[PDB]
Design a protein around this ligand. Sequence first.
Ligand SMILES: CCOc1cncc(C)c1-c1c(C(=O)O)[nH]c2c(C(C)C)cccc12
Ligand SMILES: [Zn+2]
Ligand SMILES: [Zn+2]
Length: 233
Amino acid sequence: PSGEYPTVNEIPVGEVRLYQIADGVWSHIATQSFDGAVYPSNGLIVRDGDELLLIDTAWGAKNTAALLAEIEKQIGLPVTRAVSTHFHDDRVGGVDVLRAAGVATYASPSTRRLAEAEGNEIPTHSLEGLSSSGDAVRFGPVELFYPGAAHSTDNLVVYVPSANVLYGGCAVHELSSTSAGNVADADLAEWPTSVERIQKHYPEAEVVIPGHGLPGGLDLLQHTANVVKAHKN
Ligand SMILES: CCOc1cncc(C)c1-c1c(C(=O)O)[nH]c2c(C(C)C)cccc12
Ligand SMILES: [Zn+2]
Ligand SMILES: [Zn+2]
């Protein structure tokens, strides 16, 4: 990639790439196959003093092991905590690897129940205070925000106040998206309302990072609403 945002075509098989978003903020990018198609996915890394906070796995056990190695190579600070932003395997697949590497894993109770029911890996610790739309809590160097049902009923977004970075996860799509992605667990009717809540809560966001694909600015929020409305119809 040589400084461009990593895509499947520039991540070697089985590997992970990092991308510097801001001072003390990186995204991580990996590739996975699902139902015979290949997808990229993102997560976040936020410096937390002399430790790191991880947001989301790298979509799979081996990808997540590779993520930890890439962090060691590129950053060299220990990952001590991880938050998963909803229950799908692109968010929790790799939690068992994290837990065996000494990382304390967290998710909302809603995510943990959904992951358990689905047969996905289950974060250890429950994040209370996020059950009502509009709720926010602090977690190390980030704020966690529950915008309401969107891509999933449990989806969380993450804001990094020091950098004005909004990590939307899978509730937010990249600008090139033409479709609403994997809508199996989505609430298409509520999704625009949930995006509006994000827009209202984080009007100073400078970088918006989707769950899959390229970061951009605030326009990703309105684009997401547009694509979801067009899909539903
Ligand atoms: C079925 C079509 O899904 C898509 C289509 N286009 C783009 C994306 C990113 C997806 C996609 C998303 C997402 O939209 O977040 N999540 C996925 C998962 C989870 C459940 C692990 C698996 C397979 C594909 C996706
Ligand atoms: Zn998902
Ligand atoms: Zn996703």
